[PDB]
Amino acid sequence: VMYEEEFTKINAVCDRLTKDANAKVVFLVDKNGQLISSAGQTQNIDTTSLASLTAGNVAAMGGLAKLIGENEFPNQFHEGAKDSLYMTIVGSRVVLVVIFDNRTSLGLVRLRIKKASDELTKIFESLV
Amino acid sequence: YEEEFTKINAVCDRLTKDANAKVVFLVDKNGQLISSAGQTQNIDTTSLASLTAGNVAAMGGLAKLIGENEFPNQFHEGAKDSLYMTIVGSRVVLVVIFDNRTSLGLVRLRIKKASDELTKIFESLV
């Protein structure tokens, strides 16, 4: 009953996503604010504080979606000057955060995020 | 009463029509609703303004964490309707809710024009 094995698969998805999508840093945050996984250039970034602020944003967005008679917004894109941010809700419990340089193709990051999200959904569904 | 306030509502009304938006809101970062235009009817405007402020504050801290200035434009994609948030003069938030059938490039171009018009109004307020 030890998985353990399923958590290593989660980190592998994050590591592959950072390399394939050519992302700067990748995070997996639970809606309760807990950091599940992180990959890439995690040095010089407060992972704990990032997870807490992600949860606060997603919770505010969730309540806002319900107010307009809409289901939770699955994808959130925030464009910056040098680096951009992408957020994807995986199975309405987990948030996949992807930080990448603006020079990287938006179509490329989105295509890889979809593959990562689908891989993660299958892992979280095996966790009953 | 207040010529500048009528100009603010006019920008929101023009934005709803021109960008073909469902509903448009103007929220202060402190959670106060400034203006609203469009299909405001079955939406709790006070609760929307409070949740917008909470989200913008979390997003502001998230931008600072990644060594970036506050994101001027925040996009949240849905199944039927999408949401757009634009920070006007780092004090006011312009919330635009629109159907996914509307062009993303069209909404963004109109939001920029509305934001520039609003910045000029808020700067005349001293």
Author numbering:
A (entry chain A): 6 to 133
B (entry chain B): 8 to 133
Paper quotes:
The ability of MglA to hydrolyze GTP is essential for motility regulation. To gain insight into the structural landscape of M. xanthus MglA, we determined the crystal structures of MglA in different nucleotide states, which uncovered that MglA can adopt three conformations: inactive MglA-GDP, active MglA-GTPγS, whose structure had not been determined before, and an unusual conformation combining inactive and active features.
The 20 monomers are arranged as 5 tetramers, which resemble tetramers seen in T. thermophilus MglB crystal structures. We therefore analyzed the quaternary structure of MglB in solution using SEC-MALS, which shows that the major MglB species in solution is in fact a dimer, in which the active site should thus be available. Thus, the C-terminus is a flexible segment that enlarges the volume occupied by MglB. In vivo, MglB3M fused to the Neon-Green protein was stably expressed, and displayed a conspicuous diffuse pattern that contrasted with the mostly unipolar distribution of MglBWT.
